[PDB]
């Protein structure tokens, strides 16, 4: 559908660093990553939710990936062995990648995080709730109603109905 | 052409079904079986359309529930007919 008159981004604009991480890699660091960077995501894919045109969300998307990148670099520096083991459980242990089979490693990895940043593992569903947030993009689309001035009119109930003219106005009045 | 590449196969089968429905058969069973094949093709056209549609898909059941009832009615009158004449053979017609 796209045409040469349409506007698209620059190659350089798209060219930003991405995670390169595996499923087990992400799903291991999920929880302690979710609460560190949620504003990034929230306003990011909030504008995506309300407005679908991705051309504008590119900037905040770059922020989202950067923020996640920052967290894992901290993880890389501080708790490597703990996190890696937790990752190794979470995939080797099951083909469904469920947290309910190596919680012991999950606990010890939490200990290391408790020692380094002293952050707390969020609730069972801390991200399951709604996300009511502040407005940063500040672009509510306009709520509007269409107007067809020349729509087909009928007979209002106030239009006066003078009693009939010339009986039934038929052949012999009847 | 869209229909020639996509809705063509359903046509060719549907027309072949009808011709077999108006051919020559010792009894009417081949006819009922012929229209039954047509129902499957009828489902085929119906589903590809309902697949154009995000959730209107479910209408399959409505068509299927109705279609099987036609078949049941079809077998109903035939089987009562053998029982009446001792046969439902086209020579009786």
């Amino acid at each position: 559908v796209i045409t040469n008159n349409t506007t698209l981004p620059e190659e350089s604009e798209l060219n930003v660093q991405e995670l390169n991480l595996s499923s087990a890699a992400l799903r291991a660091g999920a929880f302690h990553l979710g609460k560190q960077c949620e504003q990034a995501n929230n306003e990011f894919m909030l504008c995506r939710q309300e407005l679908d045109d991705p051309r504008a969300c590119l900037a905040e998307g770059k922020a989202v990936t950067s923020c996640a990148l920052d967290f894992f670099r901290k993880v890389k520096k501080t708790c490597h062995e703990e996190f890696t083991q937790y990752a190794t459980c979470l995939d080797k242990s099951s083909g469904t990648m469920a947290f309910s089979h190596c919680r012991k490693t999950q606990g010890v990895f939490d200990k290391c995080i408790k020692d380094n940043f002293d952050w707390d593992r969020p609730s069972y569903g801390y991200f399951s709730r709604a996300k009511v947030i502040q407005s940063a993009r500040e672009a509510p689309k306009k709520e509007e109603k269409v107007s067809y001035p020349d729509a087909t009119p009928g007979l209002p109930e106030d239009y006066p109905k003078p009693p009939a003219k010339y009986g039934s106005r038929f052949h012999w009045l009847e | 052409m869209i229909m020639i590449l996509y809705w063509s196969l359903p046509m060719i089968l549907f027309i072949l079904g009808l011709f077999c429905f108006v051919s020559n058969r010792k009894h009417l069973l081949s006819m009922l079986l012929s229209l039954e094949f047509i129902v499957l093709m009828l489902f085929f056209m119906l589903f590809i359309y309902l697949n154009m549609l995000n959730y209107e898909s479910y209408f399959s059941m409505m068509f299927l529930t109705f279609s099987v009832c036609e078949g049941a009615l079809g077998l109903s009158i035939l089987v009562s007919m053998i029982r009446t004449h001792g046969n439902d053979y086209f020579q009786s017609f």
Binding site: I2, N15, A30, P54, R55, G61 | -
Partner: protein, 97 residues
Amino acid sequence: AKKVKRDEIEMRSAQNVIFPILVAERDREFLRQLRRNRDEEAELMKNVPGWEVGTWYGEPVFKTLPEDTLVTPIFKEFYAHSDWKSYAKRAHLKLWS
């Protein structure tokens, strides 16, 4: 059942955390690929009677949409210059090619 709901929700809560990162790395490739896809549509119909990229010989495919409205190409269009190996690699993943 409380235990079943407990872990399923945890999946869903872990689920929502991950998702935006996938979308973010998703948008870049979509726009990158669209750039290339328009380039080839331009570079392959160089000698065609009246070809107009993104339209059918003139008139736009969509008109009620305002200008600078991006309509995601249908899957086939997005793969208009691709081999089966590419096509199946995504299409037939439920079926496990």
